[PDB]
Design a protein around this ligand. Sequence first.
Ligand code: PC1
Ligand code: SF4
Ligand code: SF4
Ligand code: SF4
Lengths: 318, 388, 176, 155, 70, 96, 56
Amino acid sequence: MFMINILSLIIPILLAVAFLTLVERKVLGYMQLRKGPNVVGPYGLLQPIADALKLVTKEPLRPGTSSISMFIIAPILGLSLALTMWVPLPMPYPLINMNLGVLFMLAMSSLAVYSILWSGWASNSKYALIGALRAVAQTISYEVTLAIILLSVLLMNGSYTLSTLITTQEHIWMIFTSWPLAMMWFISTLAETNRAPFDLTEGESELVSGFNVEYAAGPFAMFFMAEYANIIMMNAFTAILFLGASHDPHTPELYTINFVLKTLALTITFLWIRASYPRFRYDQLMHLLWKSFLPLTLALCMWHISLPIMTASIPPQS
Amino acid sequence: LVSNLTLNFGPQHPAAHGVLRLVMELSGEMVRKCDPHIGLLHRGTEKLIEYKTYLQALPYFDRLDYVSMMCNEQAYSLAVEKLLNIQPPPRAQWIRVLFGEITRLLNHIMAVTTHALDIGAMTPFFWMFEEREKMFEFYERVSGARMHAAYIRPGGVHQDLPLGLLDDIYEFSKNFSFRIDELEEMLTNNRIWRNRTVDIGVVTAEDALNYGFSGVMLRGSGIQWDLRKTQPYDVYDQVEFDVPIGSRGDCYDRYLCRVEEMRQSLRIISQCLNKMPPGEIKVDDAKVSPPKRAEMKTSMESLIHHFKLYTEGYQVPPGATYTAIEAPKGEFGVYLVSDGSSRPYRCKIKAPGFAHLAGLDKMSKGHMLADVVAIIGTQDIVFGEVDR
Amino acid sequence: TYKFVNMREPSMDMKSVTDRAAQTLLWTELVRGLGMTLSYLFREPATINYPFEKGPLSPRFRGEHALRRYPSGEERCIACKLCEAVCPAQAITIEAEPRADGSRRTTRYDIDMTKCIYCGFCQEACPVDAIVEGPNFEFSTETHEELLYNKEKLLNNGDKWEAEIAANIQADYLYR
Amino acid sequence: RGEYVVAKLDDLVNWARRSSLWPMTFGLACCAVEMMHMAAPRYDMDRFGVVFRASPRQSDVMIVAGTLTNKMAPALRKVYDQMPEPRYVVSMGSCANGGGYYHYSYSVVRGCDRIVPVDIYVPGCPPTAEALLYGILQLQRKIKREKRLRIWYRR
Amino acid sequence: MWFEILPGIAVMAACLFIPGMATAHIHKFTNGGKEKRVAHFSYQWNLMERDRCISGVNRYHVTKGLENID
Amino acid sequence: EDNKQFFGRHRWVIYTTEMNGRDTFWDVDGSMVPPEWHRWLHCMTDDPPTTKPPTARKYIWTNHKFNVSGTPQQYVPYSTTRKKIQEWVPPSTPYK
Amino acid sequence: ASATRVIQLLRNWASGRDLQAKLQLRYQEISKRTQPPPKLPVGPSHKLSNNYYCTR
Ligand SMILES: CCCCCCCCCCCCCCCCCC(=O)OC[C@H](COP(=O)([O-])OCC[N+](C)(C)C)OC(=O)CCCCCCCCCCCCCCCCC
Ligand code: SF4
Ligand code: SF4
Ligand code: SF4
């Protein structure tokens, strides 16, 4: 039965990724006075299937200068991390219930930077390596703000347990208590998934596709699935962290509906950023992180350590 | 250990503005020199023109700056008419100015939206390419072709406007400023767009003059110079408009100049619509402009002149001219040599993009790799006229 | 006359500086951009349902070529070669001779449609409205050879499209 | 017999391959702007599943939109070789078709089909965005009638 | 127009709803119709281990009340 | 036609399912529109052939044909001129 | 032009301007695709006398 739980978690997530491709294309199209996929199936509903089928029957050109061991290990690591990021998530009850769930997510997402450091190195070409190094530096630099923002927010939670976030946000959203940290967290999440003006590793008009140039068909498809799973997962984490839904122990379907709707709204906002802004330069986003986000994050961590102590509002640790 | 990355490639790159090989060495992150390698769209246009009659050479100019077709053919027509010592009729001149400003709108839409798309703002491209499609419809309604009209000819224009065209041009123009507003609502004040354009590709006014720059690349640096005002052609002296002038000579100032030029193009188009005069649309001299088909099928002289103009062409008196117009991309000119026959002896085409791209190395000094994409976009470059 | 595009200095008082600080820290112009895209999402798209819906054209549109006839069925082309003389791309190849009935008619009339620039100079030069550019624009081919048109091909194009070619000509000949 | 299963599988794979025709932006000259007009909202090539793609490693069709010069032909053949299979080439415009206005030039290759095999020849100078869209749908119908698995079953 | 994006969003919503509902219902099924007991600390684990021992059926969730002894 | 739609969508054709011996339930294309309706469909005029029929000619095709490229009905070019140089044919009678 | 009042209000607010008066989609405001025949004027030298080509 637990195996069935794992399967009924993984497979719907991959399906949601597949149709997130369609949803993103349609949202971009309608923001651009066009339609997007509306021919292949009703309202493009069979388009993700067409993409998945075409990709797995397309020739996966592997580079002659590629260390194939890591060339295939990188997609495995990426997709395995992208899937395992959902196992502690408290759609009302988690698959895996840990004391340190958000710490587990921080660690697992920090292991995901290897899939770029290994793909760029394995692909050789002597230039995709530079794009991979830029991506890794961006990822590790925004890990700092992710970690510190999570630390400051959880000082109202009292623990690293994600189920406790539901209890913490019973009467009020955590957004009303930490909105500046919410904006910085949301932009950090944007930057970590290489999205929006932070998509420097796959700049369509900067370096064509960067670290993913040599990957084609199948491994490219799995990398794409990993990225979109990470996008939906990060938006789910954001919804649980800042927009906690009311929970009825006798009707958890209500919480699930609430959470899914809020996660979809945040994902649609992620696609909304993509259609509205130009692209940051690499040094420009590094400057943003290091000289704008980091000082405010340090100050707000200070503030959120001081605040529960000076108001006798320290949460329980149980 | 000096291993400055010599990435000497990028033609297939989507931001290469078509076909461009860039030879680049970087001192780490920043550009040390740019070496544009052009000729990937050199089709021998200037040699082919020597084998073409004067009428036969006109369609070659549609395909030089294939974003500003009617402006190129206007420049060529002005040169040939100057050599012929003939004058196009007033209605033809007003039509030429109106469609030159429509063409400037088309070119500026393409330039600004592709610049933004290269930077990473893809959305304004589609909104404005719908307006571009409508102006393509105007082109096709006047000439039968969406892009390469071949409509403006030495002597005037090919045929008159169809009934109801001015009404549709008025309907389009009365709504276009709202689209410029929406384009500015996404770019002008955006802290990311300005971060990618402010103080990027700064060129000194004197250094802009000495490098042969023209148009927005001049007025971006504050130089008060516009061919439509200083050296007016057609009926441009009878139309009122403003010349937007920059102050910092960077990509952002040039972008603002192009947007305000779109607004002033709308302003000119309004007067062209309101002041279109009656009359013929080609010079009433059948030894230069072909007669009406009805006269060709009825009158002996008209038939003879139709035959000769469409087989031999008109003879142009011997001489050479350099005539230039204020094209949407800068000063577009031609040095046209005539030996007295019906074919040009020599036709050198002056394209502003040639001199502008010659200055890419200078303007990219001490800038990152992502800034060169912006600097190419701000020099708006069509390699059909760079390479000819 | 001219105008300055970026010659405004920002005001430096309490209220303006606070306005700019709030714009910096609360991302208000980024919110304006989000609003513009959101407003475009709720606008009817300009897309047409091709091929069930078609882009609008005019009678002057220059598409596929055709050779025309008189109402008697006799060809209009009397092989003057004016179109071949004027053709900017030298896409027109013509051979002629007296026909068995004595008429001045072509025996070869080729248009290299891959040499053609579709300028319409041939139909301007023609004194009898024999060669025209028709309304057809959907004639892509799977091989290069089907785009090297024959006299038979062009006459079949004329017989195929004459019904609408003649209507277009009647619509626009008074401008010519 | 077992030829019905092979026919159904071929139909499935050829529906998936023509429903996701991802082309490569080879914009050489004036034909490039009519192709981004077919990209524009009025025609919206994305509604057919025809996306705006990137590096040839994820492209299924090459669109040669513009004049190919002698200086440029080796690069075009290089990127054609780098396309994974199945791959198709659409020649758009007179210049790419057979040289066009510049057919008799010293520096212009007379038709891209001297360099690459071409599947569809789209005529016009330039072809209208609707003409290019017609060529794209015609290419889609070419893919629909391929019989790769039925060829294999009778080998 | 924009409401034709809704089908893909509905498919996404169903695919995202499935995991949470499945987790809740599997937890109810395998824990005696009640919520899966949470043991973050050794005291809760010891509570569950005592529960398993006294149930007689080696299942912590079979709850013995005052009907068992008193 | 639906004149309350915007220009370019106010007119459309629902193609036939069968034309010239070819099934066209799923496989349609713009070349299937006959020239009489081609003018109205692309808004070159405001009048359909129902109200303003084309002029009848005895040489106009009575059966419109779509693009037959890729079919055995495709056009293949050939020289339409006759041979220029006539060779000398030797006598059939030997000299010896 | 088929958009409901509520959707029109939402998009007017989001864009910050009343976009219903300047719709980018054309409607019955365009000119008829069938027009009356023209009658174009003749040039200045369409004269029967006082028109020798050596003087022009
Ligand atoms: C009693 C109360 C005590 C505590 C008080 C706490 C402080 C309250 C006041 C602080 C307000 C500002 C908070 C931090 C804001 C960011 C800081 C920063 O550097 O900003 C400027 C920075 C840098 O701006 P800049 O570039 O103009 O300035 C840089 C520095 N100078 C001025 C010197 C040039 O900008 C950004 O961070 C831009 C982000 C880009 C992406 C935009 C995304 C738009 C969409 C957002 C949607 C909403 C997000 C959240 C969604 C929901 C999530 C749950
Ligand atoms: S349209 Fe122009 S290029 Fe084509 S055949 Fe006629 S004259 Fe020659
Ligand atoms: S088609 Fe017209 S111009 Fe050409 S040879 Fe025949 S009659 Fe002369
Ligand atoms: S075919 Fe015509 S429009 Fe296309 S690139 Fe060649 S000259 Fe330009």
